[PDB]
Structure formats: C-alpha cells, structure tokens
Ligand binder design. Sequence first.
Ligand SMILES: OC[C@H]1O[C@@H](O[C@H]2[C@H](O)[C@@H](O)[C@@H](OC[C@H]3O[C@@H](O[C@H]4[C@H](O)[C@@H](O)[C@H](O[C@H]5[C@H](O)[C@@H](O)[C@@H](OC[C@H]6O[C@H](O[C@H]7[C@H](O)[C@@H](O)[C@@H](O[C@H]8[C@H](O)[C@@H](O)[C@@H](OC[C@H]9O[C@H](O[C@H]%10[C@H](O)[C@@H](O)[C@@H](O)O[C@@H]%10CO)[C@H](O)[C@@H](O)[C@@H]9O)O[C@@H]8CO)O[C@@H]7CO)[C@H](O)[C@@H](O)[C@@H]6O)O[C@@H]5CO)O[C@@H]4CO)[C@H](O)[C@@H](O)[C@@H]3O)O[C@@H]2CO)[C@H](O)[C@@H](O)[C@@H]1O
Ligand SMILES: OC[C@H]1O[C@H](O[C@H]2[C@H](O)[C@@H](O)[C@H](O[C@H]3[C@H](O)[C@@H](O)[C@H](OC[C@H]4O[C@@H](O[C@H]5[C@H](O)[C@@H](O)[C@H](O)O[C@@H]5CO)[C@H](O)[C@@H](O)[C@@H]4O)O[C@@H]3CO)O[C@@H]2CO)[C@H](O)[C@@H](O)[C@@H]1O
Ligand SMILES: OC[C@H]1O[C@@H](O[C@H]2[C@H](O)[C@@H](O)[C@H](O)O[C@@H]2CO)[C@H](O)[C@@H](O)[C@@H]1O
Ligand SMILES: OC[C@H]1O[C@@H](O)[C@H](O)[C@@H](O)[C@@H]1O
Ligand SMILES: OC[C@H]1O[C@H](O)[C@H](O)[C@@H](O)[C@@H]1O
Ligand SMILES: [Ca+2]
Ligand SMILES: [Ca+2]
Ligand SMILES: [Ca+2]
Length: 637
Amino acid sequence: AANDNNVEWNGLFHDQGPLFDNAPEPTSTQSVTLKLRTFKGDITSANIKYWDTADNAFHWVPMVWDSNDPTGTFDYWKGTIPASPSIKYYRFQINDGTSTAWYNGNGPSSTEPNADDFYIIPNFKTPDWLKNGVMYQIFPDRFYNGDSSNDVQTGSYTYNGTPTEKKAWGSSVYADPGYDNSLVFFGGDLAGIDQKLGYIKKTLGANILYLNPIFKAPTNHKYDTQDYMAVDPAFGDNSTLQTLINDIHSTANGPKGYLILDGVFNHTGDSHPWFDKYNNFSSQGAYESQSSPWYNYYTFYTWPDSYASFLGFNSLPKLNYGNSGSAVRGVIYNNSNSVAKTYLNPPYSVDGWRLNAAQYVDANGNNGSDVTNHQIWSEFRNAVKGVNSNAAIIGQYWGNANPWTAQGNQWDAATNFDGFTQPVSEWITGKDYQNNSASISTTQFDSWLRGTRANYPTNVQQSMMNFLSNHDITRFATRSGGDLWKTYLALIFQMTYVGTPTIYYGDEYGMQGGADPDNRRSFDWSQATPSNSAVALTQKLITIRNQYPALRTGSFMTLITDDTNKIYSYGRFDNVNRIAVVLNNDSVSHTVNVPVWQLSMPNGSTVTDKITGHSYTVQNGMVTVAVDGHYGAVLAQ
Ligand SMILES: OC[C@H]1O[C@@H](O[C@H]2[C@H](O)[C@@H](O)[C@@H](OC[C@H]3O[C@@H](O[C@H]4[C@H](O)[C@@H](O)[C@H](O[C@H]5[C@H](O)[C@@H](O)[C@@H](OC[C@H]6O[C@H](O[C@H]7[C@H](O)[C@@H](O)[C@@H](O[C@H]8[C@H](O)[C@@H](O)[C@@H](OC[C@H]9O[C@H](O[C@H]%10[C@H](O)[C@@H](O)[C@@H](O)O[C@@H]%10CO)[C@H](O)[C@@H](O)[C@@H]9O)O[C@@H]8CO)O[C@@H]7CO)[C@H](O)[C@@H](O)[C@@H]6O)O[C@@H]5CO)O[C@@H]4CO)[C@H](O)[C@@H](O)[C@@H]3O)O[C@@H]2CO)[C@H](O)[C@@H](O)[C@@H]1O
Ligand SMILES: OC[C@H]1O[C@H](O[C@H]2[C@H](O)[C@@H](O)[C@H](O[C@H]3[C@H](O)[C@@H](O)[C@H](OC[C@H]4O[C@@H](O[C@H]5[C@H](O)[C@@H](O)[C@H](O)O[C@@H]5CO)[C@H](O)[C@@H](O)[C@@H]4O)O[C@@H]3CO)O[C@@H]2CO)[C@H](O)[C@@H](O)[C@@H]1O
Ligand SMILES: OC[C@H]1O[C@@H](O[C@H]2[C@H](O)[C@@H](O)[C@H](O)O[C@@H]2CO)[C@H](O)[C@@H](O)[C@@H]1O
Ligand SMILES: OC[C@H]1O[C@@H](O)[C@H](O)[C@@H](O)[C@@H]1O
Ligand SMILES: OC[C@H]1O[C@H](O)[C@H](O)[C@@H](O)[C@@H]1O
Ligand SMILES: [Ca+2]
Ligand SMILES: [Ca+2]
Ligand SMILES: [Ca+2]
C-alpha cells in the first residue's frame, strides 16, 4: 500500500478484541483506547467519530500512528475516547488524500454509515464464565431416568380430562389415542442428570447446563407452571436440586460448572393456585373468584372464561405486572423470596435464568415489546445482579434482541436464532430451522453473520446462546437428511465462532427429530460415546475452544468467502494467539491457500490444525491445507 489517494479496505480492520480495544467492558472512570489497522503507509489521516448520549452530539478524536505489526505489513492507528458514565457509539473516518472510507461494526463503507456503530456501555458487564463456557441444554424428562421411583405412570394423574401416558425408553414420543403429546413421560429426572454429569463435564467437557422447566407443572415440558417454589415430583424434589447444583459446581468431578434455569415469567399454567381453573387447591384462584387475593395477577376481558394468555392458549394465563412495586413483580423478582431470587440465593445459588417468552412480559395484558416490558426487565436486572452480579440473564427472542441488550440495563444476551441458528442452518443444510427450503451462499453467510453481530455490544456478542437447535425447532440432523458430515461442519463452526457454544442434548451425536414434540426424543446412551464420530469431534472441539481464549473473546476477521468452491475462512485472534479456521461447505475436497498473513502470522512460523494434529509452515503469508467436503481445519499458533 501507499499514499495514492486510495484507502484499501482489505488492510482496514477493527473490533473490540484485545488488540484493538484496551477496555471492552469499562467503568465510568476508565477511558477507552482504540486501535485501527491499515496497510502500512496506506493512509494520511484517520479519525474517531463518536456519538455521546451525554449531550446528544458527535465528537471528534484525531488518531495517531502507534506502530507496525510484527510482520511490517500493517499500521496501527491509535485514539482514545474519554472516560464517563454515558453510553457512546463510534465509527472511524479513514483518509488517504482524496480518498475517504468509513468503518464501523459493519466493516468498511464508501459512504458514512448511520447505524451499526461500535458500542461503549460503561459499567455494563456480562458474566465472563458465560463468555468462556460451553453450554449443554437438557429437556429433563428425555435425558436420563436416574430414579424410576418418581416416574409418571400411565394413568398416574389426569390434566384437563386426559390421563398421563408412560413410554418405554427409546420409543416414539407421540401420544397414543386417548392421550396427549404434552402428557407423555419417559422418566427423565434430576438424579438422572446428576448421574450423567461425568459425560457432560468430562466426556464432552461442557461446563454450563441449561435446563428447560423443572418446577411443578402437569405437562412434560412444564411451561405451564403450577408452583415455582417446588421442583416437580417427577424430576425429584428441592433437595434433589440442591444435590445436583452441588455436583455441578463441584470441581472434583471435572471443570467448575454453572446451572442456568428456565424462567417462565410471562405466564403460569391454568392450574396454578393463583389461577386454579380446575380447583386443585382449597384456596381460591383468580378464575374461581373475583375476590381471590390473586385476582389482579391476571387480566380478564370477560370473567372468568376470557382472559389474556400466551398466544391464545387458555392453559397459559398471562401475568399482569402492573406498575413498579406491584405484588406480581414482587413474587417474580423483587421479593427476596421471589422465584428469581430464591434460586439465586443459598441454598440453591443457581447461576442464571433463561427468560422464556421474555418479549411478551407486560402489564394489563398487553403484548410487551414496549416501554413497560423494558422497564420490567431493567428492574429484573438490578434484582438479579443485586443478589449475584455473576448470575447470567439470557432472554428468548427470535430476531434482533438489540432493544433488550444495547443499553446494558437488561439482558446479558439472548437465544441467538437470528445470529447463529438460522444462518448456520441455511448455509449448511439449505433449510431454515423449521426445515423449509432456504439456502444461502458462503458470501451471504459471512454477510449475515457480520450484520447480526453488529446488532449487539461485544460482550453481548460473546455471551449469545449459539445452539444448532432446541426444543422449539427441528433437529439439525433432520434438516441435514441424516448426513452426519453436515453436523461435523456445524460443530467445528459452532465451537470456533463468537458466542456461547450451546449444545441441545443429542445434537452432539447426531440425533434426529422434526417439529415439536418429535424434537424432544429420549437420549440414546449407546450413541453417547467417543465411538460416535460426532461425539468425539464435539469433545475434541470443546477441548480446543477451552485451549485458546482467542476463540472465546478474541477478534473476528473474515479471510475467505469463496462461493465457487464453497470455502469459508475466518480468523480468531488476540495478543497471544492467531487462529485461522477453514471450513469446506462443499461435497468434495479442496486445497486452500489460507492468507494467514492477514492475522499477522510470521513467515517461517508454524501452525497446527488442532483437528488433525497435522502441522504446517507459514511461507509467503500463506498456508496450504487440504480439507474434506463438509469439514474444517483449525490452524492455530
Ligand atoms: O417420519 C418422518 C419422515 O417422514 C416424513 O415426515 C412426515 C410425517 O411422517 C407425517 O406424520 C407428517 O408429520 C408432520 C408433523 O405432524 C405433527 O402433528 C401435527 C398435529 O397433529 C396438529 O395438531 C398440529 O396442529 C397445530 C395444533 O393443533 C395447534 O394447537 C398448535 O400447537 C402448537 C404447539 O402447541 C404445544 O406447544 C407447547 C410447547 O410444546 C411447550 O414447550 C410450550 O411452549 C413454550 C416454548 O417451548 C418456550 O420456548 C417459549 O416459547 C415462546 C415462543 O413461542 C412462539 O414460538 C413458537 C413459534 O411460533 C413456532 O414456529 C415454533 O417454533 O414453536 C415456537 C414455540 O412455541 C412465539 O412465536 C415466540 O415469539 C416465543 O418466543 O414459551 C412457550 C410457551 O410457554 O407451550 C406450548 C403451548 O402449550 C404442543 O405441545 C406442540 O406440540 C404444538 O406444536 O400448532 C400446531 C401446528 O403448528 O400440527 C402438527 C404438525 O402439522 C407432529 O407433531 C410433528 O412432529 C410432525 O413433524 O408430515 C411429515 C412431513 O414433514 C417426511 O417426509 C420426512 O422428511 C421425515 O424424515
Ligand atoms: O508509541 C510507541 C512507538 O514509538 C516509536 O515510534 C515513534 C516514532 O519514533 C516517531 O517518529 C513518531 O513520530 C511521528 C512522526 O514524526 C510522523 O512523521 C509520523 O507520521 C505518521 C506516519 O507514520 C508511519 O508509520 C511508521 C512506519 O510504519 C515505520 O516503519 C517508520 O519507521 O516510521 C513511521 C512513522 O514515522 C505511517 O506508515 C505513515 O503512513 C504515516 O504517515 O507519526 C509519528 C507518530 O505520530 O512517534 C512514534 C510514537 O508512536 C517506535 O518506532 C514504534 O515502534 C512504537 O510503537
Ligand atoms: O440501539 C439503537 C441503535 O443505536 C445506534 O447507535 C447510535 C448511532 O450511532 C447514532 O448515530 C445515533 O444518533 O444514535 C444511535 C443510538 O440511538 C446503533 O448504531 C444502531 O445499530 C442501533 O440500532
Ligand atoms: O453426499 C454426502 C457426502 O457429503 C460429503 O460432504 C462427505 O464428504 C461425504 O462423505 C458424504 O457422502
Ligand atoms: O432472509 C435473509 C435475512 O434473514 C434475516 O432477516 C437476517 O437477519 C438477515 O441478515 C438476512 O439477510
Ligand atoms: Ca493508500
Ligand atoms: Ca424418573
Ligand atoms: Ca380452589
């Protein structure tokens, strides 16, 4: 490069990784020093332009040359944004004579952007164990029956005039005639999970567990809560939970673990004593009497048959959060003996909550996604973080969760459907996560990922729940036609991308299943061993991620987007590590010349494909590696 009235986008780069930001999660008193990369001697001037919420105006901070990278290929321009309590957003204006280019969260641009600027949210912190961990999701009843004595039997009890049905382990999940899909139980419980911690924390290596509902409820999924204060008898009791939490936190059976619980706070089941539609309690619920001490916990349009609920389901009456200081906000999160704080406090001390249907939480029966909804979650945050500043908060949202995270006063992250699940699904399987035809090329994939990451602050990005699938969508293995290689590719990408790798029990070995409830089959433990290639790779990958901080909290730079050969290469890097990931989304093999010079990997230095053990030597900024179709290489140094 040179001073030639031309700013070369290729050399330009910046994100909030260690090399470019010395304060990614600053306090009110820490200033943020930014570094921008450009080809050596490529520009003439560069400036940081930031909008400060303090005075609603833009501010200018001319940058100065700071240094060259070890390979003398790039320049690092420096500039500092002053320390203060206010949220700020910035972008860079890069000049080279008569040529100007802009750069922000969405990369280089010819015209000045007005959205996707980088974020600086003082005092906003997301739990680092979440950024650096690997999560494992479990749908309780279908993981492992560790205690058959608490098993729900056929006919044990009935719900809304329908007996429960028990299935032999491994059988189909669909209810037989006379029964209901939501009342089919396989016997999965807490003792079961406790007995299989070794497989989770050692065989795989995951250090975080997220469980679907485990509180008293009549269904098998349990989102129709009957009592948040008691573990459903079928899964055990509260002391069984205490034991499990102790074994999860234990460092004597593997790495230190963390437990995240599903919080269904937008509604309750219709059989919860506060509502008591079927009169299962001597107390009087809202449905039973307009005098009920809990009458105002709900919204009735025409008492008692017509009332607000979750998406029209009468079994899920919607809670009325009213205004600040309301009884409802008290039992859910404000009171020390509320659902949220009870489990966050001893003798439970869980590590976080997954906010179910979080966007709908509101007052008076409205559907949220408004001021009230956001006011509630920001109070929810103070409450949780007041009890444990390291307790994670991850909300369920299928689109852009920027409105619930970009101000650092609500959730730490969100279920990454839009930023991970969908793009990965369409790129590798040619299907969206509902299994309908939807394909995207590599260039598109890379563009989809960049735009979605730009929707969130860096610490949020690094805390997003990235799963290939879950209890509400179809199995990745099913969307791929059983082609286990597509699972390999998915895993390698998932374990090396930005965000919390999240495995939905079964995906690690390639489990199938279509739309609910078929996406909640019982875990086949004969497949749960390294003899299964998917499992072995999963474990291998998890070890690799835990080995390099760069894969968890490092920068991310796109390296190759080849739609012809279907090759995707990106680099994860920081002050100490440079890692080039090369993915082959094609069905045949391809030899790729990886431009590792982009990550400043010195010539003559060696790299190692952590996935095969095979080592390579960097020569002329490149590294040639052969990669099978639907597979990948993780060149690290
Ligand atoms: O062998 C296979 C090979 O061969 C071929 O395959 C063939 C196959 O052989 C054929 O048989 C054939 O099968 C097709 C499919 O048939 C299915 O059966 C049909 C049913 O018979 C029929 O009744 C049904 O019709 C309606 C139904 O009547 C309606 O009532 C309605 O029901 C919806 C839903 O209700 C209940 O859901 C529960 C949940 O289970 C429970 O967990 C909880 O939900 C909570 C969430 O879990 C939690 O995360 C949170 O979520 C909040 C979000 O909610 C909303 O998101 C929705 C989203 O909108 C949906 O798209 C989807 O993703 O679900 C999510 C989650 O709900 C909201 O939008 C978001 O914003 C929120 O964030 O909170 C909630 C609440 O707390 O509670 C709910 C409610 O109580 C039931 O339990 C559940 O089962 C049910 O689905 O809708 C259905 C229709 O949608 O229709 C089905 C299908 O037509 C079988 O069941 C299927 O398994 C089968 O796939 O054809 C196939 C061909 O494909 C093939 O050729 C080969 O390829 C195969 O390999
Ligand atoms: O901060 C630690 C830093 O210290 C040392 O760098 C000093 C340097 O010794 C000073 O000369 C420098 O002062 C000015 C300089 O007078 C001015 O001309 C220059 O203009 C910007 C141009 O900078 C160019 O970068 C480097 C180039 O990459 C090097 O190979 C070459 O030897 O030096 C130049 C800078 O002179 C850039 O490529 C051009 O496009 C720019 O037009 O700006 C500097 C600084 O404002 O101050 C430096 C303090 O940082 C060490 O040499 C350095 O390694 C340490 O990182
Ligand atoms: O979070 C909403 C919105 O915020 C955007 O940041 C700044 C923007 O940089 C500034 O130019 C404008 O005046 O104010 C907004 C904040 O209100 C961010 O760039 C967007 O992506 C984001 O959607
Ligand atoms: O068509 C399916 C094919 O996908 C490719 O990615 C794999 O390398 C092959 O082994 C497999 O047979
Ligand atoms: O369907 C394609 C689009 O899907 C979603 O809206 C993504 O957020 C967007 O980035 C992508 O372009
Ligand atoms: Ca130039
Ligand atoms: Ca059991
Ligand atoms: Ca009653």
